[PDB]
Amino acid sequence: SGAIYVGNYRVVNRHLATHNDWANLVWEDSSRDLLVSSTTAQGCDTIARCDCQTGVYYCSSRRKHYPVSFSKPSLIFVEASEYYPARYQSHLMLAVGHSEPGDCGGILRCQHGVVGIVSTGGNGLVGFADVRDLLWLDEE
């Protein structure tokens, strides 16, 4: 579990969204595993606007932050899970690092701010849904 809180927005994995998230929906995209809902309080996270390929992510299954090198956002084939059939997920970045299903939501960040959130993984790999192209998160 985990979310990004920026402005009056809450960014979560779409497969972990609550009824309150759907009842206060701003935007959702199944192909990216992302959902954004509105909030009453203002958040403290800042979104990175950069081309970094190195950062640090939070791994709840180890209670630790790990430094990682990650690929550029791309269209990657993801295996069937209890949440989606086997399909291509877009805007996904991969890295070598520990991950388990419940690690989804952990933040990946660089010197500029939040880059994305854990969305996929397995066998020593971890995949992050990028949010750096969602410029509208910084306003309204």
Ligand SMILES: CSc1ccccc1CC(=O)N1C[C@@H]2C[C@]2(C(N)=O)C1
């Ligand atoms: C950190 S996710 C993970 C890690 C190890 C093993 C298995 C998983 C779970 C997984 O394969 N998922 C979670 C989410 C539904 C997914 C997607 N974004 O298409 C794919």
Ligand SMILES: [Zn+2]
């Ligand atoms: Zn950066």
